[PDB]
Amino acid sequence: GSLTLSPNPATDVVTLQLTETDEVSGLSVLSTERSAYEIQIWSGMRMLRSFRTNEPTFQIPMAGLPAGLYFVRVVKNGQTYTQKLIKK
Ligand SMILES: [Cl-]
């Protein structure tokens, strides 16, 4: 499993992509499994907002959040992926 956030740095909308790494080719697949997951937006060791979706591609609204250092965390089937995200 892989997490990609675009663009970098974050504007009002961050596109999150959760692709499956194909076990044969090693290429990134946009899977039709569409399993539910949770996206958490963290800053200063506080979970500020969360979103729940089945879409591997999701636009995160960062509206209302000030400029600074954030962490985006995906919780999917027990597995977590966390990435530093700078909001300008
Ligand atoms: Cl944090």
Residue numbers in the entry: -2 to -1, 706 to 791
Which sentences from the paper describe this structure?
Gram-negative bacteria from the Bacteroidota phylum possess a type-IX secretion system (T9SS) for protein secretion, which requires cargoes to have a C-terminal domain (CTD). The T9SS is a specialized OM shuttle of protein cargoes that includes a rotary motor, a translocon, an OM-associated scaffold and an attachment complex. T9SS transport requires a C-terminal domain (CTD) of 70–100 residues, also known as the ‘T9SS signal’, which contrasts with the short unstructured signal peptides of other secretion systems. The CTD is apparently necessary and sufficient for T9SS secretion.
Eventually, the structure was solved in the primitive space group P3121 by single-wavelength anomalous diffraction (SAD) with data collected at the selenium K-edge, but it could only be refined in P31 after the diffraction data had been detwinned. All this notwithstanding, the final structure, with six protomers in the crystallographic asymmetric unit (a.u.), was backed by solid Fourier map density and exhibited good validation parameters. The two LKK sheets are arranged with an intersheet angle of ~35° and have Greek-key connectivity. Finally, the C-terminal segment of strand β7 encompasses the sequence K787–L–I–K–K791, which is found at the C-terminus of five unique serine- and metal-dependent peptidases secreted by the T9SS of T. forsythia in addition to mirolase, collectively named ‘KLIKK-peptidases’. Structure similarity searches with LKK identified the CTDs of PorZ (Z-score 10.0, rmsd 1.7 Å, 72 aligned residues, 18% identity; see) and PorU (Z-score 9.9, rmsd 1.9 Å, 78 aligned residues, 19% identity) as the closest structural relatives. We found that, in addition to the much longer Lβ2β3, LKK lacked one residue in motif Lβ3β4, which is relevant for T9SS function in P. gingivalis (see §2.3), and the conserved glycine was replaced with methionine. Moreover, the mutant strain evinced substantially less extracellular PPAD activity. This confirms that the CTDs are not functionally interchangeable between P. gingivalis and T. forsythia due to the disruption of motif Lβ3β4, despite both species belonging to the Bacteroidia class.
